[PDB]
Amino acid sequence: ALMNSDGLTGLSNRRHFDEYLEMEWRRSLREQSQLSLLMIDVDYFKSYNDTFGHVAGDEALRQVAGAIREGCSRSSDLAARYGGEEFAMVLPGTSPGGARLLAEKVRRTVESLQISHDQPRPGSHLTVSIGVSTLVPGGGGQTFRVLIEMADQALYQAKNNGRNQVGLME
């Protein structure tokens, strides 16, 4: 077993990520500071594995992890593979605008890989959709997972508005 990382990509694993996110949520709750989150998801990944095989798939995920840690400039940022082709990045102290720009950096860096795909049509390249959320944590029964929920809602927006794009929550 691995304690903090993902075997395939070498990024953080889900458990390590969730724990960090909860600490940062609570930090932001006490500071009343903005906490942003990216949920990043390879487009047409099912088709991709079916057509090119799980080895090709794994190599693609590895390259995407590379794109992702590249966007992971600042020490306080943390990137994980949440599961399958789903990744996550926490961005403490990051405004909606800053979160969105960084997601665009990641999105473009993924396109720069030029990984050939035949979706949405022959001659295409691998892309990611990204949901961005940001919140100043509040009172009552509101856990850190609301931030994930918001990003996942943003992710649906991006996925249903044509993919290869960033969705936004607020």
Side-chain angles (χ1 to χ4, degrees), residues 1-169:
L2 299 151
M3 185 67 182
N4 295 331
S5 73
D6 165 52
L8 175 65
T9 69
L11 301 174
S12 277
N13 60 39
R14 195 187 299 100
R15 181 204 57 82
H16 189 59
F17 183 85
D18 278 0
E19 289 196 9
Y20 185 71
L21 181 54
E22 181 181 26
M23 299 192 335
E24 288 305 317
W25 174 263
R26 193 196 303 117
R27 179 192 302 263
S28 282
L29 174 68
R30 305 178 196 239
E31 288 177 337
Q32 291 293 290
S33 59
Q34 278 168 329
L35 175 54
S36 294
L37 173 72
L38 276 39
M39 294 313 293
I40 301 156
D41 187 296
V42 184
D43 296 321
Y44 304 109
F45 190 65
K46 172 136 193 293
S47 242
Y48 190 90
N49 272 62
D50 182 79
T51 300
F52 303 103
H54 67 260
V55 170
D58 288 357
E59 169 61 22
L61 285 187
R62 217 171 296 124
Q63 294 194 232
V64 160
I68 289 175
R69 47 165 70 87
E70 296 194 25
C72 253
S73 55
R74 70 218 303 261
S75 48
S76 52
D77 295 340
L78 182 50
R81 185 156 73 107
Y82 217 70
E85 78 275 18
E86 198 184 34
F87 300 76
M89 301 189 56
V90 190
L91 307 169
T94 300
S95 66
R100 177 191 60 81
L101 288 169
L102 200 176
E104 290 295 356
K105 185 187 176 191
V106 179
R107 190 179 56 76
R108 298 288 299 126
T109 298
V110 165
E111 293 188 292
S112 77
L113 303 176
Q114 291 191 314
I115 302 176
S116 303
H117 201 345
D118 68 2
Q119 307 292 144
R121 69 208 107 237
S124 292
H125 296 292
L126 223 201
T127 62
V128 287
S129 289
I130 303 177
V132 168
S133 65
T134 139
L135 273 175
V136 182
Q142 186 199 42
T143 73
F144 67 99
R145 301 203 169 268
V146 68
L147 200 49
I148 302 177
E149 175 187 309
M150 288 304 105
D152 192 41
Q153 283 179 343
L155 180 60
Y156 179 95
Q157 179 186 259
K159 288 280 183 180
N160 286 282
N161 193 228
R163 298 174 169 92
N164 187 33
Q165 77 197 71
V166 176
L168 296 174
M169 140 241 198

